[model samples]
Target chain A: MAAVDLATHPGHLARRLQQAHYLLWNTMVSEETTSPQYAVLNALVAEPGLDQRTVGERVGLDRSTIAEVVSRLGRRGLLDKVRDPQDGRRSLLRLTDEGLRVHRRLGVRIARMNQVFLAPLAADEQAVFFDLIRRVADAAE
Target chain B: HMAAVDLATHPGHLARRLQQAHYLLWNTMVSEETTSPQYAVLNALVAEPGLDQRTVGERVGLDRSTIAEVVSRLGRRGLLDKVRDPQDGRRSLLRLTDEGLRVHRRLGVRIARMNQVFLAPLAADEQAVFFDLIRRVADAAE
Candidate 1:
């Protein structure tokens, strides 16, 4: 049997895309807050007072991962946890003032990094790429 | 307009999600023991036998440390054998064992099928466009 070209493989391509994004993220964006961590922060910035589980659902993080991220953010003073007024058992998450500052700052860097990440494609192609990737990523949910 | 951050449009976020989805599909549809990167190593050896570890790594887009770990694991499993390059004497050339070849063939079929599921969200034409666009972006990282 002949060897398959790794370039043609979707899984392989996805992994490479992720690797590239990670490199760009570290170099262009913050090395301190990871992509997932930034995602949690972004979720909070958009919708404050979300419980950890809902935040995880919004950002595609698993349960344990969300827990750890929330813990790390809390320790970093990027977020605060408050008991839900409606439910004592549930705790809601909101970004601290510093967290909002970090998110806003990183937001600019992320936008720049994304431009470099998709530079291989033309303006029209970038739109197509985003549309297609969003479809595949969302379908995975 | 300064609205809230929209993760849906972020390329990096989307790539992370795509990778997570691929990981799930690869584990469920393929072998949990043999990861996608490991299979890539086996495939590289099958295509070009007697390539050194570094060359194999380059062929498959793995870095030195990552390829070393992967080669070590596959070697421990007896899927491949490494011979010291008599010419260079410093390079450990790699070749797939018969078992490695067998596993590659098996996993190759599964990987092909798994990609179909991975790309199920797109139509045929869109899949082609996706492959083209992703390849360009991935290659640009080189």
Candidate 2:
């Protein structure tokens, strides 16, 4: 029997795309600040006092993953967790001054990184690629 | 003027999320033990038996260390058989065992179903476009 073409598999393609993204992210973006960590910071920059769960939802991280991310950021003094006055059980998350500064710096780098990641495609194709990928990614939620 | 950053608009971010989604779907709908890469290895052997380790890795897009570990694990599980190459004593050639073939057939069915659920978010037309676009990007990475 002829070997199955792995190219036809979406899982194969997804893995390759992720590998490419990871390579570009580390080389072009900061190796110290990971993509997920940057995502957490970006979420906090956009929403100052979001709870851990909401921030994870905004950035597509699971509970344990978000907890680790939050803990690491706090350790680095990039973020703080404040107790919600109205909701005693919840700890709202926000970026520190340094965190905001890091976010700003990384934001510019990420913008350039994205351009290179999608440089293989034409402008119209990039738009379509983003739309399709977003739809699939969002379906997980 | 400052523009708000939307991560949803970023291709790398979306690719990470898509990979995460695929992981979830693979675990839930497919086997928890056999990873997608392992399955790719199995499928490669099914297509061409007695492929050497390096060539098998190339076919499945795995690096040397990764493919070595995957082949080791699969061999330990009795899913595959590896023997020194007859033509070249240094290289190890690989083939699926009967059990491996059975597992492949079973997982192949589940994977097809899982892919349907994974791609259910898009219309048929959109899926074709997605495949084309993603293929271009993935191919370029190589």
Candidate 3:
């Protein structure tokens, strides 16, 4: 009946939050390694020898993104991809020694970035904010 | 002190997850060929006729290129017409055609429903705070 409002729209809100996250990530973290790249490193550390698709699923990235990140990391010698003996067609990924070291160093910085992101919220508000965010995200996904 | 936050729970991770959620919602909701930005452009034309393209984009928080694409698509659909502003030849004014008006009206209903579904995880009481946080964060980002 009336015009649609963009203000407070979930899509708009999500897009803005994504922009904010990128801005913070770029400023706080190294531009060389993105959050998704870090996600890949983290995933491989926890469970070594994951395929690209599985790594993407674990980190919520799409297949193309997973491929890109894996390619770049492989080039930088941060991770190794070798043929899976069980399946000749499939390749499993694992973080190299250098990747693990980088993850440990970046891990501390990422934690500080999180604190900066949540600093705007009150102690009470943080719980509600994060809780609602997860709940709404799950529902939408 | 060791970092207490879970990597999965950081704003960067949560934002990515929420972005996926929005993509899912966008595909399911807004049945029209129009995107959220496109819908906003058409809707804005209905509410305030004869606004220039830049102004429409400004109101909807879209950049010039995005709004230009949207305006072009809506124009191709015959939903809205854009013409030179008599006062400023460099500016283009937009207006919804009769068809655009009807389409905008119908889309408004669907979008409202979509917003409700997106917020369904929260109780009725918490929806306000949820939106408030979104608004605050969005504004802060800007």
Each candidate: what lDDT? 0.88, 0.86, 0.79
- Per-model i-RMS in Å? 1.8, 2.0, 2.8
lDDT of 2 by residue, B23-74 (tens): 9889998999999988999999998898988998888888899999999999
lDDT of 2 by residue, A29-123 (tens): 88889999999998887888999899988898999999999999999999999999998998899888899988888888988887777778999
lDDT of 1: 0.88
Local accuracy of candidate 3 as per-residue lDDT tens digits, B25-124: 8778877376766777777887778899888877877667877888899889898987888988888788888988888787777877888888888897
Per prediction, the TM-score for chain B is 0.91, 0.91, 0.82
Clash-forming residue pairs, model 1: none
A1-115: candidate 3 lDDT, tens digit per residue: 4654566677777876887788778888879998888888888888888887788877888899899999999999999999989889888998888988888888888887777
TM-score of each: 0.95, 0.94, 0.81
**How well docked is model 2, in DockQ terms?**
0.64
Error of 2 at B58 (Å): 1.8
lDDT of 1 at B43: 92
Tell me chain A's TM-score in each of the predictions.
0.93, 0.94, 0.88
- Model 3, stretches more than 4 Å misplaced? A27-32, A51-53, A62-64, A85-91, A101-116, B1-5, B86-90
DockQ metric for all predictions:
0.68, 0.64, 0.50
Q: Could you arrange the candidates by TM-score from highest to lowest?
A: 1, 2, 3
